[PDB]
Amino acid sequence: QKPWWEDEWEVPRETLKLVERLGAGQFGEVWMGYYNGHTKVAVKSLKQGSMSPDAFLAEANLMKQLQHQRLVRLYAVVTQEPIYIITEYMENGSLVDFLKTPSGIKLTINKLLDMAAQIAEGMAFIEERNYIHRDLRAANILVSDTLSCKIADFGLARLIEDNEYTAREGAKFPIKWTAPEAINYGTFTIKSDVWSFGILLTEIVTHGRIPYPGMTNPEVIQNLERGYRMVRPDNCPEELYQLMRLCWKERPEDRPTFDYLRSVLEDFFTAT
């Protein structure tokens, strides 16, 4: 990697003004702020000792390789402690949160499908660049002031050199959003993301409801093994439900590509 004095992303910390905190956690905080006074940005600060600085910055390095309108763009980094990762700011927050606001609640199925396609479009890019996300869920999709969506949180994202990535035996993941093969064997592929996308679609149409209503994780796994899939969400268009089912097919290879998903959702949108 280019040393910081030559890296185009490194910026003097003096260029940043942290204004409002958007999140506080075990490993640090995320603030809304301004770059050189006029440009609104999001600033991720690492909590010293909470985790490795190399681990922290690794997400930024990957984002240098994955630039696209549909993905939250890396803005800059401050690699001298305290460490910051600065990114493009999304005014309407996370999708899971937005869909619960007065504005979000009033969205038509037409606009929900539009957003769904925007998300598949972003994943199609990730798909084509030989990467995987692994944390695809409504909570990790950000919404702009113009109601456009972008993929966020690349913490678990990985460049796939061969067909898959194998996680650590101890690695744990959200059971309801993760593909069977991934939960069982720790094997992740772009097809695992496709399964997650299916779950995300249920989050979209139910305006942020937790998937598999009234079911615990063990119940979800048991039902899946029987061949059952999530029950049709209330008011979920059947065509969308059947698209979801494609994402949840038993064999990873039988699941569709994200480009296919994008194409279909775009047809669903232009039809409504």
Considering the complex, what minimum distance in angstroms separates the CB of residue 263 from ligand AM0? Answer: 26
Pairing of strands 141-143, 74-78: unpaired
Binds ligand AM0 by CB under 6 A, chosen from 9, 75, 84, 89: 89
Q: Which residues contact 126 (CB under 8 A, 6 or more apart)?
A: 66, 71, 132, 133, 151, 157, 190, 193, 258
Nearer to ligand AM0, 127 or 153 (CB): 153
Q: Is the CB of 89 or the CB of 195 nearer to ligand AM0? A: 89
Residue 145: which residues within 8 A CB-CB, separation 6 or more?
A: 91, 92
Q: Is residue 262 close enough to count as binding ligand AM0 by CB under 6 A?
A: no
Exactly one of 11, 16, 28, 44 binds ligand AM0 (CB under 6 A); that residue is 44
Distance CA 182, CA 175 (A): 9
258 is an annotated ligand-binding site residue:
no
Residues that contact ligand AM0, how many (by CB under 6 A): 18
- Check the annotation: does 25 bind a ligand: yes
Is 198 part of any known ligand binding site? no
- Binding to ligand AM0 by CB under 6 A, coded x per residue (else -) over 106-145, reads ------------------------------------x---
Give the whole-angstrom CA distance, residue 131 versus residue 119. 15
By the 10 Å C-beta count (0-12 exposed, 13-18 middle, 19+ buried), 199 is classed as buried
Q: How far apart are alpha carbons 32 and 35 in whole angstroms?
A: 10
186 known ligand binder: no
Closest CA to 77 of 5, 174, 143: 5
**Can 135 be counted among the known catalytic residues?**
yes
- Considering only 22, 109, 147, 175, the residue that binds ligand AM0 (CB under 6 A) is 22
Helix ranges (DSSP H) in 91-247: 95-98, 102-105, 109-128, 180-185, 190-205, 217-226, 238-247
The residue ranges that bind ligand AM0 (CB under 6 A) are 22-23, 30, 42, 44, 59, 72, 85, 87, 89-90, 93-94, 97, 142, 152-154
Catalytic machinery residues: 135
**Residues within the annotated binding site?**
22-30, 44
